[PDB]
């Protein structure tokens, strides 16, 4: 788990690089949402990982929100914080259960 200012995979900080990995994507969740939320696809099922915290997510379900799942599972992510803020992270945890 990375909660440092330094991205775990700085090479995926590049947006074009993340979006490349979603060139095709057969799963329910929108790929632009996934990319903006910091994820890139591993190329194995629906596994994605955050470039910053290195947090991985998989088994996506219809209606699931990439930023919400990002905050639910990896609330200490610095990229997540920079984009979404502490209020959002905390509210995700007040309304969700793991």
List interacting residues with Zn ion (CB under 5 A): 50, 52-53, 55, 74, 77
CA distance 12 to 14: 5
CB of residue 46 to Zn ion, shortest distance in Å:
17
CB of residue 74 to Zn ion, shortest distance in Å:
5
**Annotated binding residue at 4?**
no
Residue closer to Zn ion by CB (options 8, 25) is 8
Cα distances (angstroms) measured from residue 57 to each of 14, 19, 53:
19, 16, 12
CA distance 27 to 5: 31
**Annotated binding residue at 52?**
no
Residue closer to Zn ion by CB (options 40, 74) is 74
Cβ(1)–Cβ(74) below 8 Å: yes
Secondary structure class of 82 (helix, strand, coil): helix
CA distance 44 to 71: 22
CB of residue 77 to Zn ion, shortest distance in Å:
3
**Annotated binding residue at 53?**
yes
Point out the annotated binding site for Zn(2+).
Answer: 50, 53, 70, 77
Point out the annotated binding site.
Answer: 50, 53, 70, 77
């Amino acid at each position: 788990a990375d909660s440092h200012m330094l991205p775990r995979n700085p090479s995926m900080a590049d947006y074009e690089a993340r979006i490349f990995t979603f060139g095709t994507w057969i799963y329910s969740v929108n790929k632009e949402q996934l990319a903006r939320a910091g994820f890139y696809a591993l190329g194995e099922g629906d596994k994605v990982k955050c470039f910053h915290c290195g947090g991985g997510l998989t088994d996506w379900k219809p209606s699931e929100d990439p930023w919400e799942q990002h905050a639910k599972w990896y609330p200490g992510c610095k990229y997540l914080l920079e984009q979404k803020g502490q209020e959002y992270i905390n509210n995700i945890h007040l309304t969700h259960s793991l």
